Amino acid sequence: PYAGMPKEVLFQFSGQARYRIPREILFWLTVASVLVLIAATIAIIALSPKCLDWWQEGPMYQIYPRSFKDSNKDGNGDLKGIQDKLDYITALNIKTVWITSFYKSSLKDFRYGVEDFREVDPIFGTMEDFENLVAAIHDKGLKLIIDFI
Amino acid sequence: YSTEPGRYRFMGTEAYAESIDRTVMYYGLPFIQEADFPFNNYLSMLDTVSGNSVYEVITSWMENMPEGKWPNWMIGGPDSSRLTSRLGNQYVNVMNMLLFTLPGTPITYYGEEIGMGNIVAANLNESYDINTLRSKSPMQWDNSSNAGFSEASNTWLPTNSDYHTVNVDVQKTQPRSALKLYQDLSLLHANELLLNRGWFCHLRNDSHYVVYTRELDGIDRIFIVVLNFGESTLLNLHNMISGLPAKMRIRLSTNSADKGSKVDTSGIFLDKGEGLIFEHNTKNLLHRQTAFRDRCFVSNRACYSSVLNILYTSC
Amino acid sequence: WWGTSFLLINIIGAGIFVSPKGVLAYSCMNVGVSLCVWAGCAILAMTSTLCSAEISISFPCSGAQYYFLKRYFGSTVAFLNLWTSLFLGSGVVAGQALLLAEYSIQPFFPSCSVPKLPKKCLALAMLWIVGILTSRGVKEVTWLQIASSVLKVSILSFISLTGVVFLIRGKKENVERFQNAFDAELPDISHLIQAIFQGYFAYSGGACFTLIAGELKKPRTTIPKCIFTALPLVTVVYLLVNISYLTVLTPREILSSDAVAITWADRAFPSLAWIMPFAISTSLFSNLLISIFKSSRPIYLASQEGQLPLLFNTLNSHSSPFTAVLLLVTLGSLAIILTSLIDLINYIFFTGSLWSILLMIGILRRRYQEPNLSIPYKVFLSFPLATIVIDVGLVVIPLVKSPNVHYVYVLLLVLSGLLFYIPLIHFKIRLAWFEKMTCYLQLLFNICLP
Numbered sequence: 001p002y003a004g005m006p007k008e009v010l011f012q013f014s015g016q017a018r019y020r021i022p023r024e025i026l027f028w029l030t031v032a033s034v035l036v037l038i039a040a041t042i043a044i045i046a047l048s049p050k051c052l053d054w055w056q057e058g059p060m061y062q063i064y065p066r067s068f069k070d071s072n073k074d075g076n077g078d079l080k081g082i083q084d085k086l087d088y089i090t091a092l093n094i095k096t097v098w099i100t101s102f103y104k105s106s107l108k109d110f111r112y113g114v115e116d117f118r119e120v121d122p123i124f125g126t127m128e129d130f131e132n133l134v135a136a137i138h139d140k141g142l143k144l145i146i147d148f149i
Numbered sequence: 150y151s152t153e154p155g156r157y158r159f160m161g162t163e164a165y166a167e168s169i170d171r172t173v174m175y176y177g178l179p180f181i182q183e184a185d186f187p188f189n190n191y192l193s194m195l196d197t198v199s200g201n202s203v204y205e206v207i208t209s210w211m212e213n214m215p216e217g218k219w220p221n222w223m224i225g226g227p228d229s230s231r232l233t234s235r236l237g238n239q240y241v242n243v244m245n246m247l248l249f250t251l252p253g254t255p256i257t258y259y260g261e262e263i264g265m266g267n268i269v270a271a272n273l274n275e276s277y278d279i280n281t282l283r284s285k286s287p288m289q290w291d292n293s294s295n296a297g298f299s300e301a302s303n304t305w306l307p308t309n310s311d312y313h314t315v316n317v318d319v320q321k322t323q324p325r326s327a328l329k330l331y332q333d334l335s336l337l338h339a340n341e342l343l344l345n346r347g348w349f350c351h352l353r354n355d356s357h358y359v360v361y362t363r364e365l366d367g368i369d370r371i372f373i374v375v376l377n378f379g380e381s382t383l384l385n386l387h388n389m390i391s392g393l394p395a396k397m398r399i400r401l402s403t404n405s406a407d408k409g410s411k412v413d414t415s416g417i418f419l420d421k422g423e424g425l426i427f428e429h430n431t432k433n434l435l436h437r438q439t440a441f442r443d444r445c446f447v448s449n450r451a452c453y454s455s456v457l458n459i460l461y462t463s464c
Numbered sequence: 465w466w467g468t469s470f471l472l473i474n475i476i477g478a479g480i481f482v483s484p485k486g487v488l489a490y491s492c493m494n495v496g497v498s499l500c501v502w503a504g505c506a507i508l509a510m511t512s513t514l515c516s517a518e519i520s521i522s523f524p525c526s527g528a529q530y531y532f533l534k535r536y537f538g539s540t541v542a543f544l545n546l547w548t549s550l551f552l553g554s555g556v557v558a559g560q561a562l563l564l565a566e567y568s569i570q571p572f573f574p575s576c577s578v579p580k581l582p583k584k585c586l587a588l589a590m591l592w593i594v595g596i597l598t599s600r601g602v603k604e605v606t607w608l609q610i611a612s613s614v615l616k617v618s619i620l621s622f623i624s625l626t627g628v629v630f631l632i633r634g635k636k637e638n639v640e641r642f643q644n645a646f647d648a649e650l651p652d653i654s655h656l657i658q659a660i661f662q663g664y665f666a667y668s669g670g671a672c673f674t675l676i677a678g679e680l681k682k683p684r685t686t687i688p689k690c691i692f693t694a695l696p697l698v699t700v701v702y703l704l705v706n707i708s709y710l711t712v713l714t715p716r717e718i719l720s721s722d723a724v725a726i727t728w729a730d731r732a733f734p735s736l737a738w739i740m741p742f743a744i745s746t747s748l749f750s751n752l753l754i755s756i757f758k759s760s761r762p763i764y765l766a767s768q769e770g771q772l773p774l775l776f777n778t779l780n781s782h783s784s785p786f787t788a789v790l791l792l793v794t795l796g797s798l799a800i801i802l803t804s805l806i807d808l809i810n811y812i813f814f815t816g817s818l819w820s821i822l823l824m825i826g827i828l829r830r831r832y833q834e835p836n837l838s839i840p841y842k843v844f845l846s847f848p849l850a851t852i853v854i855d856v857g858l859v860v861i862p863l864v865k866s867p868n869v870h871y872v873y874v875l876l877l878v879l880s881g882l883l884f885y886i887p888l889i890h891f892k893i894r895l896a897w898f899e900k901m902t903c904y905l906q907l908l909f910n911i912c913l914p
């Protein structure tokens with residue numbers, strides 16, 4: 001078994017059990033360890049609780065659209081003003097933004113009298129403003145829910 | 150539209166002038182999905198505060214709810230008088246704490262973090278309910294013109310006359326403002342498993358104070374929340390809870406000047422509208438004891454392994 | 465010709481599946497910055513590939529780059545290169561194992577973060593099974609590798625076509641992000657360097673055909689032309705892949721998500737039916753096998769000369785190297801356990817650029833006193849001079865920024881290279897117990913030197 005030992009002297013001590021069985025033992029131990037790792041992984045993936053949903057982990061913020069922020073010098077709040085203040089909402093560690101009714105309406109109190117369910121009231125902006133606000137909210141990792149009558 | 154992962158769609162219902170048994174029916178059935186949760190506004194219906202009333206509200210909601218469901222809480226809304234005018238200024242801070250320690254999802258009405266009050270009723274040309282216009286004043290941002298809400302000569306509603314000293318801008322510098330406490334409570338709720346999850350165990354009712362605990366299996370730490378809703382008084386935690394040290398460290402308090410201070414367990418002195426959150430290291434969780442299995446609730450039960458630093462269901 | 469086809473099939477690699485997040489992880493969600501970052505990475509890889517082709521046509525194999533170092537530097541430099549390339553290969557195989565296990569394990573968790581423990585366990589299991597498959601058995605499977613290449617090119621083509629179609633349709637929600645770009649805040653230079661590292665890993669990943677380029681038959685005739693015809697194609701493919709990902713996903717979810725392709729398919733076509741994770745996992749497993757074989761080859765190739773571990777030059781079992789495979793498995797397991805994936809890439813290609821610096825100065829040594837004796841080139845090696853400064857800029861500022869001490873530890877290991885080299889060679893000390901251990905291990909595993 002000297003340095004650089006060739007093939008012929010290899011068949012001189014491998015026959016001995018002390019050099020015959022440990023190789024097989026190590027091979028089967030390694031494959032057993034591989035199976036143990038697979039079993040541990042498949043056990044940990046199961047038996048694990050389902051994680052909380054987005055509406056279960058973070059607080060919600062309720063906003064009255066007409067009294068949050070004006071952005072066109074008209075006296076009424078609008079969606080653009082809401083978009084312009086998303087940094088303040090983020091600084092509050094808020095997860096969900098809740099906006100009350102803003103559809104095109106003829107009566108804005110005593111519940112709501114809606115004149116069109118697929119339009120935004122002109123005093124709040126246009127549909128393009130709503131789409132921009134939704135995109136801005138989704139970019140910052142927030143989520144939006146709206147009222148329905 | 151809720152099949153794509155990460156895009157679940159929420160839906161809740163509003164029923165206000167109703168009883169608790171008819172309200173909890175919107176939660177659905179174990180084999181029928183009806184709603185995620187009905188909005189809870191029982192707290193916002195209180196015109197006066199005491200330990201007994203808050204205890205009754207919390208216990209009623211937590212007992213009538215189906216087991217395993219997700220609760221929620223509100224303290225104000227567009228159809229209710231603002232909190233600092235309904236109950237007074239002294240209760241502004243403590244209620245916020247109550248909102249951020251109960252199990253479930255908290256809901257905040259705009260302007261509650263600053264602490265706005267109602268405005269004197271005024272008549273408008275448009276048709277509106279004069280009895281509810283008091284809670285729809287514009288947001289107060291800074292001490293400029295119309296409180297920074299608009300740059301126009303006239304707003305659709307008058308702004309509150311105290312905006313010169315109560316606005317977002319001034320409170321971002323003051324270290325004792327309600328905004329700082331709200332931000333601290335929100336951060337603590339977002340960065341602690343014990344608050345966004347885990348058991349909620351409440352002790353016996355009292356006329357002055359409300360005391361409860363939050364805990365989880367395998368954390369070895371508990372949060373003890375104590376709130377004083379009556380008058381200034383003295384409290385001895387040894388009688389209510391056994392196995393506590395003589396001195397305890399306040400993790401958070403409504404009076405921000407006492408953060409990190411040490412108090413004596415027997416003889417805690419509380420002022421009108423005060424709140425303390427103690428963090429305690431122990432291993433005797435209440436929900437495992439025999440006396441308290443009837444006063445602890447969870448949703449999505451889980452256990453934490455620190456050695457593996459994971460969560461598992463079988464406990 | 466099919467030569468460029470084989471070249472691109474080798475080049476495409478497997479990093480394209482992981483980099484889009486990391487590059488977007490740095491630069492703070494700036495799309496234009498990321499596009500410029502991969503543009504610069506592609507140019508840098510162009511230059512490095514050209515220099516590597518020069519060395520390959522001037523020198524046969526990896527041992528021939530070792531001999532090149534011997535010609536133009538001392539033996540210490542070449543030995544340091546050898547042992548550093550050992551760590552490079554170990555880190556590469558560890559990263560591939562992490563990526564494979566992580567992609568396989570993601571689908572079970574629908575919309576949350578996968579815990580680190582199952583990911584590490586599965587990565588260790590995959591690395592161990594690949595290591596035990598390489599030795600005592602299979603060296604290469606042609607059918608599986610052909611199928612994996614076909615699947616990978618099909619997936620890439622499908623993603624590119626879908627992105628092109630969605631961009632052409634002109635919907636506002638799909639194109640508005642491309643317009644009004646660059647409004648995000650400008651990051652620091654360290655984030656630029658990290659993004660460059662990730663992009664270079666993406667694009668140069670699998671572009672290690674230096675040995676492959678060494679067996680070509682048209683020196684200075686088609687190899688530069690082959691590179692000029694192949695590399696910009698995969699550059700455009702990668703850029704348009706970014707186009708598609710940013711078209712149908714937001715930067716926030718791309719950064720928060722772990723498997724970019726899986727979430728891309730989830731949002732685009734909610735009918736994948738677990739086909740995409742399985743296909744990508746099979747492709748990554750094939751790439752792992754190919755990479756472990758290609759990394760085991762140079763160790764045995766250079767083990768026959770100038771190596772203290774004479775035990776390494778021992779073909780055994782079914783004519784397979786054993787010591788090199790075991791050492792690679794051990795180092796890969798340590799890399800899996802002790803650290804994450806992105807920082808592994810950062811350290812790996814920081815070391816890669818650090819050694820490319822010395823490769824470039826050796827090429828300049830071919831021109832240091834004899835500029836005329838350089839290899840024939842289109843612009844007479846003007847570009848490598850600039851790439852030297854580029855690499856210097858890459859290596860300098862991570863030290864002054866110093867956000868992680870592991871950067872210092874890399875240089876500490878490099879210096880320990882010479883620290884170990886000095887007593888072995890200069891003093892020529894031999895250990896009897898070393899011989900005893902070698903003989904015992906030879907008798908244990910039937911280890912013999914042919």
Ligand SMILES: *[C@@H]1O[C@H](CO)[C@@H](O[C@@H]2O[C@H](CO)[C@@H](O)[C@H](O)[C@H]2NC(C)=O)[C@H](O)[C@H]1NC(C)=O
Nearest residue numbers: 270271272273274275276277303304305306307
């Ligand atoms: C709208 O409200 C205003 C004031 O509440 C009413 O009167 C306006 O203002 C002064 C007196 O307040 C009048 O001299 C103006 O002529 C009024 N302006 C306008 C534009 O009418 C006003 O009558 C109300 N209008 C309606 C339709 O109810």
Ligand SMILES: *[C@@H]1O[C@H](CO)[C@@H](O[C@@H]2O[C@H](CO)[C@@H](O)[C@H](O)[C@H]2NC(C)=O)[C@H](O)[C@H]1NC(C)=O
Nearest residue numbers: 290291292293294312313314316318319320322
């Ligand atoms: C209104 O808010 C401003 C903003 O801080 C207060 O401070 C004034 O404005 C700048 C900012 O410090 C200073 O240069 C002025 O000197 C401040 N005014 C005074 C009187 O000190 C300001 O005090 C607030 N109140 C009023 C009435 O302006």
Ligand SMILES: *[C@@H]1O[C@H](CO)[C@@H](O[C@@H]2O[C@H](CO)[C@@H](O)[C@H](O)[C@H]2NC(C)=O)[C@H](O)[C@H]1NC(C)=O
Nearest residue numbers: 199200201202204205352353354355356357358
């Ligand atoms: C805690 O429990 C109840 C509160 O509902 C109180 O006991 C009742 O007090 C009211 C007041 O007259 C009456 O209903 C009875 O006299 C009591 N018993 C029952 C069964 O109702 C008790 O006092 C409360 N503890 C306090 C306030 O410290």
